Amino acid sequence: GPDETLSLLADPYRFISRQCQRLGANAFESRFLLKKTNCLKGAKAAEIFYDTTRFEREGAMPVAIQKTLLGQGGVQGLDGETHRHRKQMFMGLMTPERVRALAQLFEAEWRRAVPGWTRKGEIVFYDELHEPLTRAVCAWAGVPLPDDEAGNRAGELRALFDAAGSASPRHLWSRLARRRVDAWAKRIIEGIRAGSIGSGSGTAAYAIAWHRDRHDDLLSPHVAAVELVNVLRPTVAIAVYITFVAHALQTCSGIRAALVQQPDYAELFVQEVRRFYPFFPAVVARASQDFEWEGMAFPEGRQVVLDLYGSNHDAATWADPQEFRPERFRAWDEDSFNFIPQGGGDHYLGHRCPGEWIVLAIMKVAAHLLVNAMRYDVPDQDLSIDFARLPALPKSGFVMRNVHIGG
Ligand code: HEM
Numbered sequence: 001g002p003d004e005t006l007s008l009l010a011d012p013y014r015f016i017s018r019q020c021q022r023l024g025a026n027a028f029e030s031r032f033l034l035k036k037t038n039c040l041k042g043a044k045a046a047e048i049f050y051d052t053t054r055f056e057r058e059g060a061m062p063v064a065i066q067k068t069l070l071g072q073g074g075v076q077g078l079d080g081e082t083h084r085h086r087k088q089m090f091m092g093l094m095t096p097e098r099v100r101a102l103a104q105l106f107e108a109e110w111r112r113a114v115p116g117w118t119r120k121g122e123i124v125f126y127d128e129l130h131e132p133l134t135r136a137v138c139a140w141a142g143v144p145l146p147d148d149e150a151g152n153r154a155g156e157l158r159a160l161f162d163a164a165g166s167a168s169p170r171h172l173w174s175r176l177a178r179r180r181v182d183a184w185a186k187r188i189i190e191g192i193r194a195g196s197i198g199s200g201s202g203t204a205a206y207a208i209a210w211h212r213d214r215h216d217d218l219l220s221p222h223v224a225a226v227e228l229v230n231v232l233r234p235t236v237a238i239a240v241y242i243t244f245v246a247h248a249l250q251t252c253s254g255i256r257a258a259l260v261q262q263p264d265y266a267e268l269f270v271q272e273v274r275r276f277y278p279f280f281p282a283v284v285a286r287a288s289q290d291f292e293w294e295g296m297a298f299p300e301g302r303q304v305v306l307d308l309y310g311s312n313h314d315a316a317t318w319a320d321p322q323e324f325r326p327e328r329f330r331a332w333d334e335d336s337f338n339f340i341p342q343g344g345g346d347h348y349l350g351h352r353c354p355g356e357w358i359v360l361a362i363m364k365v366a367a368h369l370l371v372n373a374m375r376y377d378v379p380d381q382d383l384s385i386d387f388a389r390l391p392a393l394p395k396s397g398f399v400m401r402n403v404h405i406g407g
């Protein structure tokens with residue numbers, strides 16, 4: 001077969017589901033670079049993808065991703081009891097009280113940032129979200145962050161996810177940002193261990209700095225740094241979902257009124273933003289043993305990718321996936337495989353995102369502020385979603401004018 005890397009990079013969110021549509025199947029064999037790859041979509045495929053007796057992650061992460069988005073030595077590259085033990089470290093951070101604490105810090109940072117937006121007269125909403133998120137998450141995680149460094153650190157965290165997938169010098173910026181953020185986070189871990197930094201016992205940086213592995217050993221400082229960045233970075237990446245919240249409010253008739261007056265609506269709305277909008281395209285794993293599934297061969301070692309966007313738009317599951325309809329979540333049964341914007345399966349026993357509770361809480365803050373507190377004008381602009389960009393965004397970044405919060 002031919003190499004389809006270029007076709008995938010040209011349409012990273014939709015390539016798999018479009019090919020599935022042409023072939024009338026939920027899976028097809030392709031090739032990306034040197035690797036034959038089985039591409040999978042839909043709930044049944046997701047359930048097999050999360051079977052850890054058939055799939056492993058070790059060695060599946062490309063070097064370019066290790067050098068930008070994820071770092072080296074983090075939980076994403078682990079399998080088995082080594083994985084489960086490291087994953088418990090992240091899961092223990094996510095109590096309802098701690099998630100609420102982060103949401104509260106974020107609301108405060110957003111409110112603190114508004115006067116600056118008012119003074120600018122016109123803002124790119126996406127561009128303005130990274131710093132308040134950075135300030136909130138650093139405070140919550142026990143990471144000291146001087147006021148005069150917050151903007152710089154927010155730009156570095158942003159570069160890890162926003163510039164990683166850019167076929168331009170921006171990718172070089174992402175690589176430098178990774179070197180810088182790893183060094184910074186390592187100084188934080190070192191300071192906590194030496195007693196020069198007094199992060200609290202319930203904070204992420206404390207938990208990670210003092211985590212003991214399965215041999216009762218502390219994580220090496222670099223690995224601890226990477227795991228701390230695995231909390232900070234994706235929290236800043238919620239900027240993308242917050243921008244999509246503003247986009248849905250602007251482009252979908254009836255949503256604003258429903259959010260303002262119906263109190264149970266916000267939970268449905270945020271879930272539908274996660275279902276509808278492209279963000280995390282797909283996940284990669286490797287077959288751990290020979291098997292066949294639905295007439296397709298999965299030889300030991302076969303690279304496999306699971307299409308999250310395509311799964312979230314599977315008409316068999318959703319019936320009318322092309323519409324933005326928060327109401328659809330009234331009928332959801334909380335299946336762990338059929339709605340997978342941040343992965344599928346079980347949080348403890350697999351690689352599913354431990355950040356979902358944070359994401360939902362922060363999205364609800366955003367929805368509340370954009371309809372109940374923050375007044376703004378939206379000038380004529382190109383709001384269409386850029387499906388060629390990683391992460392996807394409205395092409396304009398969502399431009400606002402005359403922003404204020406006294407109204
Ligand atoms: C901003 C939107 C986010 C999206 C779209 C997202 C999506 C994902 C996805 C698709 C995965 C991989 C699932 C897999 O490998 O099977 C993942 C893993 C992960 N996410 Fe998120 N996530 C987000 C936010 C967060 C937040 C706020 C945190 C804060 C702790 C977080 C921490 C992690 C970690 C540590 C993993 C690796 C878990 C593991 O490998 O066991 N994420 N996320």
Ligand SMILES: CCCCCCCCCCCCCCCC(=O)O
Nearest residue numbers: 161164165233234237279280390391
């Ligand atoms: C030069 C080729 C590399 C391509 C890199 C593609 C990476 C896709 C990342 C886009 C989604 C970003 C979501 C945030 C992820 C997180 O913070 O863990």
